[PDB]
C-alpha cells in the first residue's frame, strides 16, 4: 500500500493563511461575503465579555466562551449560502478564531478544522433552532453568546428564527495549530482603526453594503458606537 494523501484540513488551512496573512484586510473580506449574500448594513462588535463554563456541549468548548467579534448583516443565509460556507473569503476568520460560530434564520453552525470538538472526523457541528430546541435550552451557557447581541432575545429562540446573520469568533488567546495570531481588545481596535482610514472608498466598491458600523460592549454591557460610515 502506497500513494499519496491530500494535507489534513487543518494545515490545508494553515497554507491558505500563510499565502494571505491579514490585518485590515479581515473586515473588508467579512464586508464582502455581506455584499454576496445581499447584505445592505454590516456591523462589528468587539465583545469585551465573558461567558460561563457550567451549561456547555462538552468540558472542551469553555476555552471559546471568551471575548470575540461578533458581525452582523442583515441578510438570512440560503441553503446555499450554507453550503457555500463550508468552502480568501469567509477562512480570513482563522487569522482571528479558531472556532468561529454563525448563526443565520433556524441555525447555528460552527466550525473546528483542528477536528477535536466533535467527534474524530468531524470539522464542526450545527443546530436547529427547532429540532434542537430541548438541548440548546439545556445547554444555556453554550448559546448564551448568540442571545442579546444584534437584537436577539431569548424570543428568538422560542420562534426558532433569527431574522439576520451574525457570526462569533472568539477571539484565539494562544497559539494554536492553524494560526499563531493572538488577538486581544487593542489589536482588534487596531483592526477597526485600519479600516477606518479607508472608509469612504470601501463603500464604492459595493452596491448592495450602504452602512457599515463598528461598535464596542464592555463586560458591564454598555455598548458604544465607534465608527459608522454610510453610503
Not at 45 to 68: C, F, P, R, V
Not at 105 to 125: A, V, Y
Not at 182 to 199: G, W
Amino acid at each position: 500500500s502506497f500513494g499519496q494523501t491530500t494535507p489534513p484540513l487543518v494545515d490545508f488551512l494553515k497554507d491558505i493563511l500563510r499565502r494571505y496573512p491579514e490585518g485590515g484586510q479581515i473586515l473588508k473580506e467579512l464586508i464582502q461575503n455581506a455584499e454576496d449574500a445581499g447584505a445592505t448594513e454590516v456591523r462589528f462588535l468587539y465583545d469585551e465579555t465573558q461567558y460561563g463554563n457550567e451549561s456547555l456541549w462538552s468540558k472542551d468548548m469553555a476555552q471559546y466562551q471568551g471575548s470575540a467579534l461578533y458581525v452582523y448583516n442583515n441578510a438570512i443565509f440560503t441553503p446555499e449560502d450554507w453550503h457555500g460556507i463550508q468552502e480568501i473569503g469567509f477562512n480570513s476568520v482563522y487569522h482571528i478564531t479558531d472556532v468561529p460560530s454563525i448563526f443565520s434564520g433556524d441555525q447555528i453552525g460552527m466550525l473546528d478544522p483542528h477536528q477535536t470538538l466533535f467527534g474524530p472526523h468531524e470539522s464542526g457541528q450545527c443546530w436547529n433552532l427547532k429540532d434542537d430546541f430541548k438541548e440548546m435550552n439545556e445547554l444555556t451557557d453554550q448559546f448564551a453568546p448568540f442571545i442579546g447581541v444584534f437584537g436577539s432575545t431569548k424570543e428568538t429562540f422560542q420562534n426558532g428564527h433569527f431574522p439576520g446573520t451574525f457570526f462569533r469568533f472568539p477571539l484565539r488567546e494562544q497559539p494554536s495549530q492553524l494560526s499563531s495570531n493572538i488577538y486581544n481588545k487593542e489589536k482588534v481596535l487596531e483592526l477597526f482603526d485600519s479600516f477606518r482610514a479607508d472608509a469612504d472608498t470601501v463603500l464604492l466598491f459595493l452596491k448592495s453594503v450602504q452602512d457599515v458600523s463598528l461598535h464596542v460592549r464592555e463586560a458591564d454591557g454598555t455598548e458604544r458606537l465607534i465608527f459608522r460610515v454610510t453610503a
